[PDB]
Paper text:
NrdR is a bacterial transcriptional repressor consisting of a zinc (Zn)‐ribbon domain followed by an ATP‐cone domain. NrdR binds specifically to two “NrdR boxes” upstream of ribonucleotide reductase operons, of which Escherichia coli has three: nrdHIEF, nrdDG and nrdAB, in the last of which we identified a new box. Tetrameric forms of EcoNrdR involve alternating interactions between pairs of Zn‐ribbon domains and ATP‐cones. Our results, in combination with a previous structural and biochemical study, point to highly flexible EcoNrdR structures that, when loaded with the correct nucleotides, adapt to an optimal promoter‐binding conformation.
We present crystal structures of EcoNrdR–ATP–dATP and EcoNrdR–ADP–dATP, which are the first high‐resolution crystal structures of an NrdR. We show that E. coli NrdR (EcoNrdR) has similar binding strength to all three sites when loaded with ATP plus deoxyadenosine triphosphate (dATP) or equivalent diphosphate combinations. No other combination of adenine nucleotides promotes binding to DNA. The structures reveal considerable flexibility in relative orientation of ATP‐cones vs Zn‐ribbon domains.
Author numbering:
A (entry chain A), B (entry chain A): 1 to 149
Write the structure that this text describes.
């Protein structure tokens, strides 16, 4: 990298330690031209926040996982492929607007529930049956009554 | 093929016409050893009946198409992978027991509905919502009331 003082396009690396407790790499660099030393930090930049799953396992944001769940609930429903992509881009925008490096998968689920509530109410019931995990048939009718309010 | 009269392991083909209106190939064969002639018919043997789709399109029986639909409805349900395979083999046995060369996809759907009715009643409602195509939220509660009888 460019020397921050003289501006030689290349500096030699002097040291490499894991100072951010694994999260970051600290390096020392020396300029060949002006013989000056400087510290650098190498940090990871995520395109989308990492997802914290129900079992506290961290995994990368998977657009396909998000899409498939919606498409399953929107089977035989009058929602175009554009409406789905339009809802996915808005959910992505909402997860970025939090500013968080990681987001609970429950948050992704609630965002999908709000898109489906606007898109199709049958698709909403289908997704809620697996998302909220209805363990009884009664649970189905109780979620329909919840939607009338 | 073997001559049906003398039993020479090979006979020469004399003619080839599409007599079964495409469904069958008729051939004439002459034996090299005894100089006798005989007619043969070549017919297609299906492992499982071909499926007539809702739009009258004929397509081969796809075990994966059958399985996926069940697995979608059985999401987060206490039905083991063995229970699913046990239900699929029984549905396959039932389609073969008809003796038909082709079966309506509606018949495959009703068979899955009866397996899910035995396996899990929440999975049954999930599959019925896409299979019977609920076009309204009311349709959901009306199918729950149908199950109580
Ligand atoms: N058959 C279905 N009908 C309606 N909605 C469904 C169906 N299957 C899944 N969904 C919805 C509700 C679920 O909470 C959501 C995500 O499904 P799930 O199988 O948990 O996938 P996922 O994207 O979370 O990946 P993972 O395999 O890592 O859990 O999709
Ligand atoms: N999300 C879902 N929840 C519950 N059951 C589902 C879900 N998606 C599909 N099913 C059930 C009901 C459907 O009638 C059945 C078959 O689904 P469908 O998409 O029509 O596939 P298929 O096997 O008929 O293939 P094809 O793509 O040729 O129509 O599976
Ligand atoms: N890695 C991921 N990236 C994007 N969406 C995800 C991811 N994992 C799960 N989802 C979505 O989060 C929502 C809720 O998932 P859920 O099944 O409740 O969580 P989990 O996978 O933690 O058990 C669904 O819309 C699902 O498709
Ligand atoms: N080619 C196939 N082979 C096996 N099962 C199939 C096939 N096509 C559809 N099915 C199954 O038939 C049932 C009803 O399908 P449905 O969606 O009602 O019909 P269609 O595909 O004709 O629109 C479901 O269990 C589905 O998975
Ligand atoms: Mg999941
Ligand atoms: Mg189908
Ligand atoms: Zn320098
Ligand atoms: Zn012969």
């Amino acid at each position: 990298m460019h020397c921050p003082f003289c501006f030689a396009v290349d500096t030699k690396v002097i040291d490499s330690r894991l100072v951010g407790e694994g999260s970051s790499v600290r390096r020392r660099r020396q300029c060949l031209v002006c013989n000056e030393r400087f510290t650098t930090f190498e940090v990871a930049e995520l395109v989308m926040p990492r997802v914290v799953k129900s079992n506290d396992v961290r995994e990368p944001f998977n657009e396909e996982k998000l899409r498939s769940g919606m498409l399953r609930a929107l089977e035989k429903r009058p929602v175009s492929s554009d409406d789905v992509e339009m809802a996915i881009n808005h959910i992505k925008s909402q997860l970025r607007a939090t500013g968080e490096r990681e987001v609970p998968s429950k948050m992704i689920g609630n965002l999908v529930m709000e898109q489906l509530k606007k898109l199709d109410k049958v698709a909403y019931i289908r997704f809620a049956s697996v998302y909220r995990s209805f363990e009884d048939i009664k649970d189905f009718g109780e979620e329909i009554a919840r939607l009338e309010d």
